[PDB]
Amino acid sequence: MKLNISFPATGCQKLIEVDDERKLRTFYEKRMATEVAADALGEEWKGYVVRISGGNDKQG
Amino acid sequence: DIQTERAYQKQPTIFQNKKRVKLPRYYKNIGLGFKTPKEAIEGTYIDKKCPFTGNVSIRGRILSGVVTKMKMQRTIVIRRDYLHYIRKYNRFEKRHKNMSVHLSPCFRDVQIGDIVTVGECRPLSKTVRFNVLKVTKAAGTKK
Amino acid sequence: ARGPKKHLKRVAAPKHWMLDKLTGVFAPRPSTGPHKLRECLPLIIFLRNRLKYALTGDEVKKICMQRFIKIDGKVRTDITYPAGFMDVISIDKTGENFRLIYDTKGRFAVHRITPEEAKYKLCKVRKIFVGTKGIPHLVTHDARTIRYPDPLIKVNDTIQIDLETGKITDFIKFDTGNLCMVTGGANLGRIGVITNRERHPGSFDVVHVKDANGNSFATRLSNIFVIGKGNKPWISLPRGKGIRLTIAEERDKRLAAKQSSG
Amino acid sequence: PVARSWVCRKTYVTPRRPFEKSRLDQELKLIGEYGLRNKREVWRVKFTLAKIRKAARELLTL
Amino acid sequence: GISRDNWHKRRKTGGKRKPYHKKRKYELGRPAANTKIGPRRIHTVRVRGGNKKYRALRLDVGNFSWGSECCTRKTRIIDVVYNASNNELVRTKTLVKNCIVLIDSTPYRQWYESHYALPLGRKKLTPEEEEILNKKRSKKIQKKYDERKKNAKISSLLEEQFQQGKLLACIASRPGQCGRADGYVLEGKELEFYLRKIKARKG
RNA sequence: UAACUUCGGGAUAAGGAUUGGCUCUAAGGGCUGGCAGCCGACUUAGAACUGGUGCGGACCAGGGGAAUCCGACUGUUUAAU
RNA sequence: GAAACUGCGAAUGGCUCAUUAAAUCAGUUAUGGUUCCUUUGGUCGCUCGUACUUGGAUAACUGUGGUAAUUCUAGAGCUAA
RNA sequence: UCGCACGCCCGGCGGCGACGACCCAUUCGAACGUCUGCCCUAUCAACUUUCGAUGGUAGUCGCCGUGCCUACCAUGGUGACCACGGGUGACGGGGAAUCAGGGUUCGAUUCCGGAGAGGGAGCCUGAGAAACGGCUACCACAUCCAAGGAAGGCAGCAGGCG
Ligand SMILES: [Mg+2]
Ligand SMILES: [Mg+2]
Ligand SMILES: [Mg+2]
Ligand SMILES: [Mg+2]
Ligand SMILES: [Mg+2]
Ligand SMILES: [Mg+2]
Ligand SMILES: [Mg+2]
Ligand SMILES: [Mg+2]
Ligand SMILES: [Mg+2]
Ligand SMILES: [Mg+2]
Ligand SMILES: [Mg+2]
Ligand SMILES: [Mg+2]
Ligand SMILES: [Mg+2]
Ligand SMILES: [Mg+2]
């Protein structure tokens, strides 16, 4: 499950490959346009809150 | 007498509620040299579909026929008779069409078998497109 | 069908355009305008088939899109603009003026006129009509609306309009004695003095009229277009003067003109 | 819808009786006295002359 | 969908007619508005030619004209009491053309007070009302209101409706298509016709 | 609502739909002095709402069709096979 | 001056004859019982109540992507009438 | 809102157009109506009606007239002068062939009018569509597929199978 991360203040964005279910428990069962603290996304991710803007499905 | 229906019956133009300390009635001449019957002026009935007292205008064709049945209410049926020429035999062939016509209650003495003059109008109902404009009594039938 | 038509077959075109059969499948459909489709004459037909200033449809498009053609005092860039009775075609660059007038047959004839005659035109009124605040109106046969007319103008009169200002200069009252031109029917193009006015309530009134040779002919009132007091036209009449010569003496003058010409 | 005429016409008509000796010998005179090519040249001339007669006869009754 | 067409029903003789074309766009119907009484709600419908029609779905106010005095005021609709077409259309409170409704007396009572200077209805007189009926009035206009007294007498039938606080009106506009509930105040012979119909209906 | 028929039947043929509760509406009459007043008694039709589609809720209460044999039918008969 | 927003057109034309028997259609008339883009002509300070020009989005574009696949589209950044 | 010019006064005035707008006429129409007109069949003689049939009143809906539909009423309407039902190897007409005078047969076919886009039904936008080289279903047929899904309508021009 790829993660498409965009930071509008600097206007920069990149794609992050993540494959660990333990790291994504914070995201599941959450609707779109909800704010989630991404502290469990890794060691570089503390103090970040990321809004979910919706992605694609396995079939696109 | 007149108010025999659920809604109040009146002519749409006459305002009958003027402050005072006989009802005036609307009527018109329909043209084409047709004389408005007297009992349409001193009468007391009302009718949307009466040519002399309602909002129907006479246009189109002016036809004639003979009365056949008078069982419907404020509408009768006349019968038009004519001949149809067939070229092969050089002969004619009697044909007839009978048609529904709205008889205003001003033409009050109408029997079976007299000649009426009908003028085309707005389509009044499913099968009625004509009003009676004058009635001529048949031969004899005066007594 | 499912909407308004936009084409016109040649064989279904009005006959007086004199369109042929083998040039094409389609005929120029007149654009919507002041004149009816069957009684008009598209600008395409006038320049390519009558005057022959062009040869094809593209050549006339170049002519009218250089703003050379001025119809009724206004510049028109529509190749299919419908020009009808009494319209003044004015091609200023070549120094030439026209007025569409029916000839003795059912056709629009080319009729060169002087520049002083091209400043005005006659037009039949169709309606008398009161505006929003008591302002009188009238409607001409070519769909002009003009306010505050002379109160003595009635529904069948004709008026003289100055094409620069569009205002009435003088009018002719419809009554017996006045000269007339027939714009429609089996007698169109004929000229005569109105003789009688027989009116049918509900139906169409008929007008009896006799030409300068004593021949009498009738027509419906909707085809009557008065063009002068007494027997003096207010316009210049074309060749033949609106006298329809029968087939018998048409050949008699055709060959006698031929043996006069050799 | 195409732009062409389709207006055509036959210029002759065959006789009803095919094998009449009197008729055969009379149109063999003409075809040899005028050097014609077949009977259809004789037939189309009888046919044009029949139009002229048919026009006059209906005019004469007028 | 809904069709207003003549080809789907029997001929004059009574024979079945077989259609030759399917349903057309211009032969369409739309669901009935069924205008109730309540806070104002109109939806607009785009109709043939690009025009507009206004579906009044809930409608509470409407201006009615008092014909005998030519006084047209905006009034609030109370109730529907009679309908000549259907008794089911008065059990539900739906406004259709030519249905007898109740409207309040207040806009007309004010006008009569300030135009004739008489009390109508009014079986204590509050300060605002007593002063308009007893204001310091010069003579020059006193006779004006005094000659206006001659025709100040209204019909008896209207009088007890004024002291009751509400009038009987008849809707003349078509609220399901115009979006308005306009009409006129009943009076005269037409008033007594609808009064005995309402009375005898109750039984 | 069929075959057939002694034209009487077959026939409740066969086959379908509906059915509660509640709130209403309309029609159907007497007596006294085309109107008014005072009295009524039960029925039928229609509508809105409403219930976990449930309603002839227990009781009562025809399975049907296509043919053959015999006796026309109703009736009677070996009390104890 | 590509691209994209905007406006218009795509209801014409072309093909075929299955349906259709007072239906279609034809001639004749009515809309004084109606809609009408467009063209032409009129109207367009008639109203008695920030204008030296108001607002925030969104394509085209840059950039990050998904699906085996479509004239499929998502999230981010700008900017016009 | 936009473009060409470019001037005149003592910053203010200026010409010619383009585009757009409410309304009225006009044009192109469209839609409902009027009257008369059609092939064969009686082994089709009675048909239509509380599942609108024919009228009345009040309304709803519709761009408007109208059983178009609703409520309440009346019992009407058509037929031997051929109704109603059925058949058509029936799209109608202007026309075509044959013809002395009469007629008989043909008109799928280039012009006008109708209808339809595999069969039905329902809509969006639009002045104008119940549109199919527009959309949404169901039926039949049929295409690609990673098996999760996507896509379709030649009675247009060619061309192919039958
Ligand atoms: Mg004969
Ligand atoms: Mg077409
Ligand atoms: Mg049985
Ligand atoms: Mg046996
Ligand atoms: Mg027995
Ligand atoms: Mg025993
Ligand atoms: Mg069939
Ligand atoms: Mg067929
Ligand atoms: Mg044909
Ligand atoms: Mg179609
Ligand atoms: Mg096919
Ligand atoms: Mg379709
Ligand atoms: Mg196609
Ligand atoms: Mg198409």
Swiss-Prot record, chain A:
There is a cross-link at K14 (Glycyl lysine isopeptide (Lys-Gly) (interchain with G-Cter in SUMO2)). Ribosomal protein S6 is the major substrate of protein kinases in eukaryote ribosomes. The phosphorylation is stimulated by growth factors, tumor promoting agents, and mitogens. It is dephosphorylated at growth arrest. Mono-ADP-ribosylation at Glu-35 by PARP16 inhibits polysome assembly and mRNA loading, thereby inhibiting protein translation. Component of the small ribosomal subunit. Part of the small subunit (SSU) processome, composed of more than 70 proteins and the RNA chaperone small nucleolar RNA (snoRNA) U3. It is found in: Cytoplasm; Nucleus, Nucleolus. This is Small ribosomal subunit protein eS6. Belongs to the eukaryotic ribosomal protein eS6 family. It comes from the Eukaryota. The modification ADP-ribosyl glutamic acid is found at E35. Component of the 40S small ribosomal subunit. Plays an important role in controlling cell growth and proliferation through the selective translation of particular classes of mRNA. Part of the small subunit (SSU) processome, first precursor of the small eukaryotic ribosomal subunit.
UniProtKB/Swiss-Prot annotation, chain B:
One of its GO terms (molecular function) is structural constituent of ribosome. It comes from the Eukaryota. A lipid is attached at C50 (S-palmitoyl cysteine). Keywords: Acetylation, Citrullination, Cytoplasm, Lipoprotein, Methylation, Nucleus, Palmitate, Phosphoprotein, Ribonucleoprotein, Ribosomal protein, RNA-binding, rRNA-binding. Its main location: cytoplasm. GO terms for biological process: translation. PROSITE patterns: RIBOSOMAL_S17 (PS00056). Citrullinated by PADI4. Component of the small ribosomal subunit. The ribosome is a large ribonucleoprotein complex responsible for the synthesis of proteins in the cell. Part of the small subunit (SSU) processome, first precursor of the small eukaryotic ribosomal subunit. During the assembly of the SSU processome in the nucleolus, many ribosome biogenesis factors, an RNA chaperone and ribosomal proteins associate with the nascent pre-rRNA and work in concert to generate RNA folding, modifications, rearrangements and cleavage as well as targeted degradation of pre-ribosomal RNA by the RNA exosome. PANTHER family: 40S RIBOSOMAL PROTEIN S11 FAMILY MEMBER, SMALL RIBOSOMAL SUBUNIT PROTEIN US17. Component of the small ribosomal subunit. Part of the small subunit (SSU) processome, composed of more than 70 proteins and the RNA chaperone small nucleolar RNA (snoRNA) U3. This is Small ribosomal subunit protein uS17. The gene is RPS11.
Curated annotation (Swiss-Prot), chain D:
It is found in: Cytoplasm; Nucleus, Nucleolus. It comes from the Eukaryota. Component of the small ribosomal subunit. The ribosome is a large ribonucleoprotein complex responsible for the synthesis of proteins in the cell. Part of the small subunit (SSU) processome, first precursor of the small eukaryotic ribosomal subunit. During the assembly of the SSU processome in the nucleolus, many ribosome biogenesis factors, an RNA chaperone and ribosomal proteins associate with the nascent pre-rRNA and work in concert to generate RNA folding, modifications, rearrangements and cleavage as well as targeted degradation of pre-ribosomal RNA by the RNA exosome. Belongs to the universal ribosomal protein uS4 family. Component of the small ribosomal subunit. Identified in a IGF2BP1-dependent mRNP granule complex containing untranslated mRNAs. Part of the small subunit (SSU) processome, composed of more than 70 proteins and the RNA chaperone small nucleolar RNA (snoRNA) U3. This is Small ribosomal subunit protein uS4. The lineage of its organism: Eukaryota, Metazoa, Chordata, Craniata, Vertebrata. The chain holds residues 2 to 63 of 194 of the full protein.
From Swiss-Prot, chain E:
It is a lipid-anchor. The modification N6-acetyllysine is found at K36, K124. InterPro entries: Ribosomal_eS8, Ribosomal_eS8_CS, Ribosomal_protein_eS8_euk, Ribosomal_Se8/biogenesis_NSA2. Its main location: cytoplasm. Residues 7-25 have a biased composition (Basic residues). It is found in: Cytoplasm; Membrane; Nucleus, Nucleolus. This is Small ribosomal subunit protein eS8. It comes from Oryctolagus cuniculus (Rabbit).
